[PDB]
Amino acid sequence: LPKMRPFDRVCLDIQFRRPDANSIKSRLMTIAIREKFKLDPNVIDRLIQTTRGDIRQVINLLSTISTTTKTINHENINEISKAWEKNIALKPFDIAHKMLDGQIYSDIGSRNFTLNDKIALYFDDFDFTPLMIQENYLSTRPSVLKPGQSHLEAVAEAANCISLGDIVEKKIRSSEQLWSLLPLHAVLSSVYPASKVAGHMAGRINFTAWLGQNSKSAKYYRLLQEIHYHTRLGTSTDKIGLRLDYLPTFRKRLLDPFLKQGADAISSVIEVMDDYYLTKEDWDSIMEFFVGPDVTTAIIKKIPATVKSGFTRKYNSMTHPVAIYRT
Amino acid sequence: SLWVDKYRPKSLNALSHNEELTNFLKSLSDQPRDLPHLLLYGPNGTGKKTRCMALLESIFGPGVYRLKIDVRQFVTASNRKLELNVVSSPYHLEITPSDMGNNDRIVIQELLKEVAQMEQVDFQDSKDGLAHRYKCVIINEANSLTKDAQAALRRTMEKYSKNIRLIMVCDSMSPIIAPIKSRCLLIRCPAPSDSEISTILSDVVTNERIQLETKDILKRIAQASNGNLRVSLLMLESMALNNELALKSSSPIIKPDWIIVIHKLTRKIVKERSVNSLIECRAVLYDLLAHCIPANIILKELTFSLLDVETLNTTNKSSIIEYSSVFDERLSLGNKAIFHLEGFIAKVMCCL
Amino acid sequence: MLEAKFEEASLFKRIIDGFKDCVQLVNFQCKEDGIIAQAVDDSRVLLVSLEIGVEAFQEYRCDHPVTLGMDLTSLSKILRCGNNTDTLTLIADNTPDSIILLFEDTKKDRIAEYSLKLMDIDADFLKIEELQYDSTLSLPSSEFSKIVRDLSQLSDSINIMITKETIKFVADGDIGSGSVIIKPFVDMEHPETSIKLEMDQPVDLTFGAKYLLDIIKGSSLSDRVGIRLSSEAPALFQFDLKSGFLQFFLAPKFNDEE
Amino acid sequence: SMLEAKFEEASLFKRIIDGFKDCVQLVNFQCKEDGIIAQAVDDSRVLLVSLEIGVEAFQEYRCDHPVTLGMDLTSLSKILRCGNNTDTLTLIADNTPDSIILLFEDTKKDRIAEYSLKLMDIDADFLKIEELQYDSTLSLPSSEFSKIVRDLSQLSDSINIMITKETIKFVADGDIGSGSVIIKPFVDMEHPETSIKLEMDQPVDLTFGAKYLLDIIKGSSLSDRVGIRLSSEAPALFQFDLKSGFLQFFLAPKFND
Amino acid sequence: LAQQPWVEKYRPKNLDEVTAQDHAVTVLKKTLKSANLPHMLFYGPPGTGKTSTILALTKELYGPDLMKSRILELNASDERGISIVREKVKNFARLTVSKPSKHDLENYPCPPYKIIILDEADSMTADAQSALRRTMETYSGVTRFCLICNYVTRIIDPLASRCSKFRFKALDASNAIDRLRFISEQENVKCDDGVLERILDISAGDLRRGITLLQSASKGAQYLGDGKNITSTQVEELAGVVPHDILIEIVEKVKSGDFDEIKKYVNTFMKSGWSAASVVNQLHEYYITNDNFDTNFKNQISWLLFTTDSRLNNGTNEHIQLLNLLVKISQL
Amino acid sequence: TLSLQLPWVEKYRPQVLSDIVGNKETIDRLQQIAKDGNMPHMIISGMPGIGKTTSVHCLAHELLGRSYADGVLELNASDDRGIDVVRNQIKHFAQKKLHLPPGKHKIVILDEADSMTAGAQQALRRTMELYSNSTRFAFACNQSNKIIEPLQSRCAILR
DNA sequence: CCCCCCGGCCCCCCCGGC
DNA sequence: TTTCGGGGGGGCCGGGGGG
Ligand SMILES: Nc1ncnc2c1ncn2[C@@H]1O[C@H](COP(=O)(O)OP(=O)(O)OP(O)(O)=S)[C@@H](O)[C@H]1O
Ligand SMILES: Nc1ncnc2c1ncn2[C@@H]1O[C@H](COP(=O)(O)OP(=O)(O)OP(O)(O)=S)[C@@H](O)[C@H]1O
Ligand SMILES: Nc1nc2c(ncn2[C@@H]2O[C@H](COP(=O)(O)OP(=O)(O)O)[C@@H](O)[C@H]2O)c(=O)[nH]1
Ligand SMILES: [Mg+2]
Ligand SMILES: [Mg+2]
């Protein structure tokens, strides 16, 4: 859990794994002998599976069942296991792996694993399941393709339903707070697309990449807003127009000069900055926006260190105007 | 300063295209004491903000161009602290409430009202020290306002018309609700003609002493801009800088990086139609979105680039445009843009 | 070159505190005559004026008038750390990016000298040409603070009416209305608390409760506050200093019903 | 004016209001030629407050015709906090009034404060709730009752009062323990104010909520003694006597089950 | 006055100044003598006179002085959460009516109740309306409620049941020509025959839009200073109506059926700034009323236009929607 | 007219474990526990109106006889059951000293335990573990998944 | 005149389907 | 991640009472 992050590397981590049945069978035999009730060794593994390796739970089960039943044999094991079986909420990776399994969507598999079960599986974590499905629905080998249907058509149908589910989610978290639509969302975002592309995973299940991309986009939008409001007194546009139209020319007037005349451009570049109330941090932020064939990372790295040092010294040795006071 | 900003006209008499609109604005400014609320709609980069500033300069004095930036605090119901940057002059205030997203409503319900419910002290040009004129509020990207903010604007526009007048600017009136349009005088702002763009570019070139082999180069820039004058001027400056301030008939037309990426994505989609191609397209879309490229712009440019492919037939283009319409509607009503973009790309891949 | 050695630095602390909420970036012009300041609020509905005459300072001198765009929050930070009884000095240089505030005391150990950065604020030629205010009055600052605090609980707008031998303050709200009507009052035993009123023409004006609360918050400068009301010009709230005054011009609420 | 009632000092009215402001929110005052009779009921409908102020408490009282004013207590307290405690307080009302005027006047100076409080439409009857012959009636100093209630409330949220021949028992049973206080009638001629008197017809035993008793004991500031009348099948009556009036709390006992 | 736009300057001052809402104004005027005003729910399209009607009703009910203390107005510019409804609205509804003065009693009917006007009530959440239900029901004796909305479906069913409904009809050239002509005469506006009718046809039920267009035309004529009657051409130009030649060109390109030509023409057309809604409306008018088309063609085109209009109403991209509509029509 | 009559649901509420119909195996197990004592920590789950509260109350009454008043601590959704309550009042009750027959223990009945927050459930763990020699816990809920896994591990499941 | 008890805001964080 | 509303739990602040 994230709450435990502070304990990352300040303690020796000791992991305890679910003990196997063989490591506890002797204890169960001793308890059964001491408490005068017959316990078949064969059914012990089934009991352990029922409690998922919880010795406290299995001892409690034995105590509760021994009050009226004096023999835990193969006959009554099924009923006892079904009555005492645990319900552990699956984690996002397990939810993604199970939802994309093609077996559960077959006729028989549908009979065993029902639609209600799938909706409950989604609700086990209703904030990450749709993200996991959207992340992993393109990386399977479908086993539910209809006669003549190709993988691409099923993927397109799943994407259409994911878009509809996104619209429903926007409705849910609006000012109306329509949380009663949570079940419907479950169908549109997780169950239906998975049923369309259910099968075997073609590779490792991956966590959603949408959160990191969203945070990066928010950071870049904040930087763009600061740059726009620093240059707002000189330009005539909104922030989008600044990103799409002004920044290329700003680069041609701020980066290219350093790559042609070396350290002779410094003053000129500074002048341009002074004309738009720009700063060194705005310089870097602007240089960090371009994509495709205009990525500056290598270009900036290849600039001689002396030129950059001279630019920094010249900027730090001169006064500059302030567009916004106490930003 | 860049040529796009250094040569922007500062008065109605300095405008150079759409003379009919200039005459209409002069007629509106002739008797400004009863000027209604204005809504200027038109294509981006045509000169809407320039014309709004020129109209204000015609109503008030040149002082409208003496701008200053201030920061205003706001508190939400949860005590969240929000900042709004306001550009103001001694005669008007400019605001972009969409900067606060869903919180824009608060700005309408707190800031604008505060301006409209009080008088102001004017110690210059007024003997009594109190202003004897209505205050103008410009709302930028009015089409980005949420429905709640637009609803809040309604009664404010009517109750305090004696003290406040609104001038809104937009690239499309479709997102504006009907009551707001009913409350405004709508002004269409057509894009400049190719000849007018060429004339402006020639004037800029003459002022900047840029060597030009033939005037047709300017013409070539004018078509590439698709009526966007800001793009035209910026492209002229970029071309001049890329050829040592000496342009030739062979001077290639420069395109922005995001447009190049979108064209490459179009080529990839046309060439390869598979799930792995879809994953690569998803990666490209994420890269484009992470760098402040609006989703609607991406969808529009991708759709038109696809429709510009010579190897596609009429059925493919019809399917592409239908899917583009459907997923534009989906984007308008959704949160996660990548979902709708991926759905559109998958549908296009299936159709091809 | 420029210094304003104070009799007591607490006076300057109160002066700065009296208008910090209204404005934060104000240009201070220091001349041999004294300190002058005029700042328009962000909303362009309130103007703050400050005058500190040369007489108030224990020892003030200037060789060339200097305009400092000193920030009020940083100045408050500097002054808060100072001691109770000092002789604040405002020394600077020919090209000051900062001003040294010398918090000197009678003793040689109780010293709280600091430095304060100076900002580059743009100042215009604000004109406050005197106007024939219709009716003016002066009443103790404590009474004004009490009236404003009591009436703010009722409503966010306060109406002031000046009529023959009548100074009516009205606060009408959702739960009810309140009035603290006062009349010309003169005390022989303690004339300092007497109410002064010179009335020429009737005045009725409505003001925002928040602005009045902010104005009274800076009433510690003087035990008395003066109000000048003109029917066609903004009101004027004045607090007399030792040799100057702190003044506020407030734009009345737009009269929609009128 | 229709109704004009003058208090020499606003302190008396403020103390009267503070005696029951924490148990009720809406109050109704009926003013007549005999004085002011006010009633209020708590939100839970478990406690009833009945205040009576006679004409002797006012410096000058005039009420031509009966008038009913329904008001909200928190607003009244907020308004009263705006006036000084050393100023004469005049309550003024008109025919079919829509508001009540509170005039704070300081004779030392020319300071007059007028406060108008808007009335609320409340159509209700007082019902003159008072049982004829209570099973038991006792009286004792308010300080002793307040101390006992405070001590017992710390142990439980319920307090039982049992009245038997020459015996008054306050009992509380809680999680950490139990407490019992037994008092017998006694009279002292040296200081009769400290005496406790009891008159019992039948034995009584009633359980009440601790929070309501804690609210009720706040009225001890208005009187040095408190009278408790208890009867089966009827609410318990706690009375604090004023100079020319009274403050009564009718508290419904808890169901015995 | 000369410092007010015509829409606000000519706002009705009394119920007799409402133009074409007699079916409800008659009942409202009757209530003056009846003095049993019920809870009201005004609904209708934009610019029909709901707010003006309620303001005039209050003016005539309480007069200029007593109105302020008898009216509580809340609109979309004010916070109206569930807490606000549960405290402020309830407290105002519980108060006794302010005492009328002798002047008011002798000069105005002075009904024995106050009015709460929740303008733009369709913007309120369902929880707030649920809270309002019993507040309106309980204190009807001293308070009456007026809910004004554009979309009646946004009002929860219990509130609609509690309120008496008043539908404000659309204002067109047949029922609102008199008011526009009166305004033009009072403003000394010279117009050719049929100009006012054309303005009212273009406004499409909104008298505010018509008045604003008339004011714009008057300003243009005054600036020109030629002393000539305003013509329908400049009226159409000011309203953003596409010229008929452009519409015929679009129709011809659609009839051609070539995707590339249609795309190029639409790209050129979108640079003029024409609104998509106006183009769609004009195309609908041209196609539905044309005799050179079969029943099946019109049946399909009606649904196509409906779909395009519904999509445009959601704030979509005008270029894409218009191109899709034209391509689909060309393939019919 | 002003005298209510007890509804049959309350009038005929089973007062003994032998008057409860359904879930024969679990009911017989509860009867055996009552006869032999040594009640374990238990969680009874199901859907509305099947006899969970009735069963718990009958078991507690039969086990504790006349010591029901002092040996039983009943809390439900109508009572405050925050983390502070669990840490103070429940802990004090568990730590309390009470004299009971050899085979009996104090009982804490948390009815509608699914409404309790995660923090209170966490706080209940070591209280249940340390004082089991004198106190036993019986939860009754409609949805078992609301109860955290550590608490379920310490209890006997009766669905 | 100063210290301690304990009521009330104030703030922060976390669900919201069957 | 998050556009309200409700609920819980902790930290202060301050009125009142006691010594
Ligand atoms: N029935 C009408 N009679 C006369 N003028 C009208 C009428 N309806 C609208 N107007 C005119 O248009 C202006 C606005 O009228 P409104 O009362 O605001 O319409 P509305 O229906 O309340 O608008 P909405 O629903 O908030 S968009 C008025 O000031 C009038 O000048
Ligand atoms: N097995 C049963 N046998 C006889 N009566 C029952 C039985 N179950 C429920 N009842 C009757 O229904 C009434 C309520 O039973 P409860 O024990 O309250 O059910 P419940 O399952 O605990 O309800 P929930 O889960 O809190 S909604 C009892 O008083 C009984 O009269
Ligand atoms: N010479 C000239 N340039 C113009 C004119 N109108 C706009 N421009 C130029 O075009 C640029 C963009 O105009 P702008 O108003 O910001 O675009 P919009 O707000 O998106 O419509 C401006 O920076 C001007 O330089 C004009 O009338 N004459
Ligand atoms: Mg309206
Ligand atoms: Mg139950």
Amino acid at C3: E
Amino acid at A241: G
Report the nearest residue to nucleotide H1, CA vs C1'.
Answer: A211
Residue to mutate (ligand 1; options E52, E57, E213; most atoms within 8 A of CB): E52
- And the tokens for A80? 């006892």
Reading phi first (left if > 0) and then psi (alpha if -120 to 50, else beta), residue E120 is in left
Cβ of A180 near strand G (distance < 7 A): yes
Would you say C234 and B129 are in contact if contact means Cβ atoms under 8 Å apart?
yes
CA of D173 vs chain F CAs: smallest distance (Å): 11
- And the tokens for D166? 């020459």
Residue C255 to residues B42, B90, E67, F103, Cα–Cα distance (Å): 37, 22, 16, 84
Residues lying close to strand G (Cβ under 7 A), chosen from 48-67 of chain D, are none
* Strand G bases within 7 angstroms of protein beta carbons: 6, 11-12, 16-18
Rounded CA separation A245/A241 (Å): 6
In three-state form (DSSP H/G/I as H, E/B as E, the rest C), the secondary structure along C80-105 is: HCCCCCCCCEEECCCCCCEEEEECCC
Amino acid at D241: D
Please work out, in degrees rounded to the nearest 5, the angle formed at the alpha carbon of residue F2 by the alpha carbons of F1 and F8. Answer: 80
Residue D46 to residues D21, D23, D217, D251, D255, Cα–Cα distance (Å): 15, 10, 16, 6, 12
Reading phi first (left if > 0) and then psi (alpha if -120 to 50, else beta), residue D118 is in beta
Atom of ligand 2 minimally distant from the CA of F8: 31
Structural domain that includes position C179? 1-258
Residue nearest to atom 13 of ligand 3 (CA): B47
- And the tokens for F91? 């802990």
Rounded CA separation D136/C202 (Å): 69
| Helix, strand, coil percent content, chain C, rounded in steps of 5 | 15, 40, 45
Rounded CA separation B168/B138 (Å): 6
Q: Is B15 in the pocket of ligand 3 (CB under 6 A)?
A: yes
CA of D120 vs chain E CAs: smallest distance (Å): 4
Amino acid at F49: G
Which of C156-174 are b and which e, b meaning 16 or more Cβ less than 10 Å from the residue's Cβ?
ebbbbbbeeeebebbbbbe
Q: How many CB atoms lie within 10 A of CB B134?
A: 20
Cα of B192 vs centre of ligand 3, distance in Å, is 10
Among D177, D125, D183, D132, smallest CA distance to D155 is for D177
Rounded CA separation A195/A118 (Å): 10
Axis-axis angle for helices E177-186, E195-203 (nearest 10): 120
H helical segments located in chain A: 25-35, 44-51, 55-66, 77-84, 92-99, 107-112, 115-123, 129-136, 151-172, 182-186, 192-196, 210-230, 239-241, 247-252, 256-260, 266-276, 280-287, 297-302, 305-316
Residue to mutate (ligand 2; options F54, F61, F114, F146; most atoms within 8 A of CB): F54
Q: Identify the chains in contact with F, defined as 3+ C-beta pairs within 8 A.
A: A, D
C-alpha torsion B146→B149→B150→B153, nearest 10: -170
Instruction: Tell me the sheet residues that pair with F109.
Output: F74, F138
* Radius of gyration for the alpha carbons in chain B, expressed in angstroms and rounded: 23
Would you call D227 helix, strand, or coil by DSSP? strand
User: What end-to-end distance do the CA atoms of chain D give, in Å?
Assistant: 54
Among A205, A184, A210, A4, smallest CA distance to A95 is for A205
Q: What are phi and psi of D248, to 5 degrees?
A: -120, 135
Into how many domains does chain F fold?
1
HSE, side-chain direction, 13 A CA sphere, residue E307: 17
Rounded CA separation C128/E131 (Å): 53
Rounded CA separation A100/A196 (Å): 9
Would you say D91 and E68 are in contact if contact means Cβ atoms under 8 Å apart?
no
Rounded CA separation B152/D101 (Å): 38
Residue matched to tokens 């820039």:
B221
Would you say C243 and C55 are in contact if contact means Cβ atoms under 8 Å apart?
yes
Would you say C252 and C235 are in contact if contact means Cβ atoms under 8 Å apart?
yes
Axis-axis angle for helices F52-64, F24-36 (nearest 10): 20
Cα of B243 vs centre of ligand 3, distance in Å, is 25
Q: Which ligand number lies closest to the CA of residue E203?
A: 1
Would you say B66 and B108 are in contact if contact means Cβ atoms under 8 Å apart?
no
Q: Which of A57, A67, A88 is nearest residue F29 as measured by Cβ atoms?
A: A67
List the 5-64 stretch of F: residues with Cβ below 8 A of A: 25, 28-29, 32-33, 36, 40-41
Q: Which H or E element spans position F73? A: strand F72-75
Pairwise CB contact (< 8 Å): D110 & C182: yes
Instruction: Tell me the sheet residues that pair with B135.
Output: B164
Amino acid at A72: I
Amino acid at A51: T
Rounded CA separation E280/B256 (Å): 34
Would you say E46 and E148 are in contact if contact means Cβ atoms under 8 Å apart?
no
Q: What are phi and psi of D100, to 5 degrees?
A: -115, 135
H helical segments located in E3-125: 6-9, 22-34, 50-70, 82-84, 90-94, 102-107
Q: Is B8 in the pocket of ligand 3 (CB under 6 A)?
A: yes
What domains appear along chain B, each with residue ranges and CATH number? 3-188 (3.40.50.300), 194-247 (1.10.8.60), 257-351 (1.20.272.10)
Cα of F81 vs centre of ligand 5, distance in Å, is 17
Rounded CA separation E73/E55 (Å): 10
Does E have 3 or more CB contacts under 8 Å with D? yes
Cβ burial, residue C81 (10 Å; 0-12/13-18/19+)? exposed
Amino acid at B181: K
The residues, ordered by sequence, that sit 6+ positions from C205 with a Cβ below 8 Å of its Cβ are C159, C160, C229, C235, C252
Nearest nucleotide over every DNA/RNA strand to the A123 CA, judged by C1': G17
Would you say A80 and F29 are in contact if contact means Cβ atoms under 8 Å apart?
no
Rounded CA separation D234/D250 (Å): 9
What is the distance in angstroms measured between the alpha-carbon CA of D54 and the sugar C1' of G14? 56
What is the distance in angstroms measured between the alpha-carbon CA of D12 and the sugar C1' of H14? 25
| Helix, strand, coil percent content, chain D, rounded in steps of 5 | 20, 45, 35
Among E179, E209, E173, smallest CA distance to E193 is for E173
C-alpha torsion A35→A36→A37→A40, nearest 10: 90
Q: Where are the domains positioned within chain E?
A: 1-171, 172-241, 242-332
Q: Which H or E element spans position F91? A: helix F91-95
Q: Which of A151, A239, A289 is nearest residue B291 as measured by Cβ atoms?
A: A289
Q: Which ligand number lies closest to the CA of residue B169?
A: 3
The residues, ordered by sequence, that sit 6+ positions from E233 with a Cβ below 8 Å of its Cβ are none
User: What end-to-end distance do the CA atoms of chain B give, in Å?
Assistant: 47
Into how many domains does chain C fold?
1
Beta strands in chain E (DSSP E): 40-43, 71-74, 114-119, 143-149, 164-167
Would you say A266 and A314 are in contact if contact means Cβ atoms under 8 Å apart?
yes
What is the distance in angstroms measured between the alpha-carbon CA of B273 and the sugar C1' of H7? 52
The residues, ordered by sequence, that sit 6+ positions from B221 with a Cβ below 8 Å of its Cβ are B197, B201, B232, B235, B236, B239, B253
Q: What are phi and psi of D139, to 5 degrees?
A: -150, 145
Resolution (A): 2.5
Structural domain that includes position F132? 1-159
The residues, ordered by sequence, that sit 6+ positions from E131 with a Cβ below 8 Å of its Cβ are E82, E85, E86
Pairwise CB contact (< 8 Å): C180 & D113: yes
